Amino acid sequence: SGPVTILDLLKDERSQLSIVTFSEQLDQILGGGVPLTKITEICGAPGVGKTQLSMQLSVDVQIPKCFGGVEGQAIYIDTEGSFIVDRVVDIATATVQHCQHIASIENNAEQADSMQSLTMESILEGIHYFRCHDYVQLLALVHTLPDFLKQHPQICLIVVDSIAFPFRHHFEDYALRTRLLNGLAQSFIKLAVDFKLAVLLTNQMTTKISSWGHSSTIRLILYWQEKSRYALLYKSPSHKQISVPFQITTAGIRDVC
Ligand SMILES: Nc1ncnc2c1ncn2[C@@H]1O[C@H](COP(=O)(O)OP(=O)(O)O)[C@@H](O)[C@H]1O
Ligand SMILES: [Mg+2]
16 A cells, blocks of 8 residues: 555545534534535525535634544635625634633643644634636636645635626526536536545525536525524435524524524
8 A cells, every 4th residue: 555645644534524514403414514525505595694604614624633623724715795704703713712612621631732723813814715706707716726725735625605696697608608507516526526625615596495406415505484594405415305493693603502
């Protein structure tokens, strides 16, 4: 066996893991969380929490190994604007607090070493943000990612928030529209596999009232029912459609309890 580098061995180990949501209920229906090497899709109407969950995932991928995490970094591709930097602060801060609790309680002198470096700021530093304003910019950026990711093997998650927004307009040539959309999917599948990371795509079209999606291994639909929030597992390897409750808090995505 070999030659492999120790870096190759670390990436194969990560390959196996999932990125927690901070909702025990979301984690259960996802199989432990958002899986690496796969594309996961979050659908729902405006205000359901696509971006909140995206941001929660971008923070969570950075949780250290000694707290059960992936300990990777994130790319966040924003195609819509109206990004609130202060939300990522709130979320990051609560994830730091949560690990500080485990390190102090149930005591390990290497969790105290990680706490040295796991701050709200180090979490914001580990998220690489790009703004795209149209589909052509988005296509050009994705073409550029193999390079970015060679320079940044820390990257374990790529968010595109949202995939649908730059395709919401009429194309004259419809055959071109699907070509381009089937190509992005294949580009995303390729990255997830060759760079051993999760691709997380946000989408408006599929709501709890509603071709593409074939490439997504998991599709979650986030919606409202009465006065609470729910996530439906709409597509998964098990093929069983379970809805679980969740809430959004200043800390981020949490269980209802
Ligand atoms: N600090 C906060 N505490 C609790 N809920 C929040 C907070 N900030 C935003 N929200 C909730 O998050 C929602 C916005 O979710 P967002 O992820 O932007 O939706 P979208 O699916 O359109 O991306 C708002 O409806 C509000 O209900
Ligand atoms: Mg949003």
